[PDB]
Design an enzyme around this catalytic site. Structure first.
Site, PDB file in Angstrom:
ATOM      1  N   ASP A   1       0.778  -1.231   0.000  1.00 58.49           N
ATOM      2  CA  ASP A   1       0.000   0.000   0.000  1.00 58.49           C
ATOM      3  C   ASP A   1       0.812   1.283   0.000  1.00 58.49           C
ATOM      4  O   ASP A   1       1.374   1.681   1.022  1.00 58.49           O
ATOM      5  CB  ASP A   1      -0.955   0.000   1.191  1.00 58.49           C
ATOM      6  CG  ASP A   1      -1.859   1.213   1.206  1.00 58.49           C
ATOM      7  OD1 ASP A   1      -1.850   1.975   0.221  1.00 58.49           O
ATOM      8  OD2 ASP A   1      -2.580   1.400   2.203  1.00 58.49           O
ATOM      9  N   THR A   2       0.842   1.937  -1.158  1.00 56.61           N
ATOM     10  CA  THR A   2       1.575   3.184  -1.333  1.00 56.61           C
ATOM     11  C   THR A   2       0.982   4.328  -0.515  1.00 56.61           C
ATOM     12  O   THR A   2       1.657   5.320  -0.251  1.00 56.61           O
ATOM     13  CB  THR A   2       1.601   3.603  -2.819  1.00 56.61           C
ATOM     14  OG1 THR A   2       0.259   3.711  -3.313  1.00 56.61           O
ATOM     15  CG2 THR A   2       2.356   2.574  -3.645  1.00 56.61           C
ATOM     16  N   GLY A   3      -0.278   4.185  -0.120  1.00 57.35           N
ATOM     17  CA  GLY A   3      -0.923   5.226   0.659  1.00 57.35           C
ATOM     18  C   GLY A   3      -0.736   5.054   2.155  1.00 57.35           C
ATOM     19  O   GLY A   3      -1.239   5.853   2.943  1.00 57.35           O
TER      20      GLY A   3
END
Ligand SMILES: CNC(=O)[C@@H](NC(=O)[C@@](O)(CCCN(Cc1ccc(-c2ccccc2)cc1)NC(=O)[C@@H](NC(=O)OC)C(C)(C)C)Cc1ccccc1)C(C)(C)C
Lengths: 99, 99
Positions: A25-27
């Site tokens: 998850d880049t967020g």
């Protein structure tokens, strides 16, 4: 490898001698996993996202392996609905977003 | 472009003719934006995050530009801690994970 986003980007990770499925998850600022045991010292932390906050235990300098790529960093453990690999570890394995 | 993850992958998006900052989030199935006005009718949707569930308004076929890339899709509007661009739109702009 190149991971498409048609489906959730799930990968197998090795940690604490265990194998678990986790979401890249880049967020996510941090890496948070469902309840599990980890060695060493830890401190409480509150993390927030959609829906609010949850309390987790923060373990630092934890060895972790993702898709054969070894890395070490902070791992949060608590009542998260799903395992998430955050930027703190994604950077270490050289993960980047491309378009 | 190629975005590293040492910092939050925050980008500028344009929706309803206005510029906003949003996070490219591969761990999100959907795109959820902070309260704003959008045209047409909306449908109800309950989405789950790390902290629990929230109710959101679902608008479909909404034009949205992300880092200059044109997209038209579903946008959820609700009490989110931050504007997040999910896979439904990341796939429209050709985004993939690489390492
Ligand atoms: C500063 N906080 C963070 O960096 C935190 N980040 C997040 O919560 C963020 O990265 C989404 C993290 C991935 N998560 C993973 C997740 C997956 C399933 C479930 C779930 C739902 C219902 C029942 C059981 C499980 C919960 C969380 N997915 C979702 O929450 C999405 N959910 C989704 O795709 O599920 C349908 C949403 C559509 C609601 C945005 C969104 C966010 C980014 C920046 C600032 C605030 C929030 C933290 C967890 C790493 C500490």
């Amino acid at each position: 490898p190149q991971i498409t986003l048609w489906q959730r980007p799930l990968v197998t990770i090795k940690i604490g001698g265990q194998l678990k499925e986790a979401l890249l998850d880049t967020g996510a600022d941090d890496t948070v996993l469902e309840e599990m045991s980890l060695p060493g010292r830890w401190k409480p932390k509150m993390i927030g996202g959609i829906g609010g906050f949850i309390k987790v235990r923060q373990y630092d300098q934890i060895p972790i392996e993702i898709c054969g790529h070894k890395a070490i960093g902070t791992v949060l453990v608590g009542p998260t609905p799903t395992n998430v690999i955050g930027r703190n570890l994604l950077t270490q394995i050289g993960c980047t977003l491309n378009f």
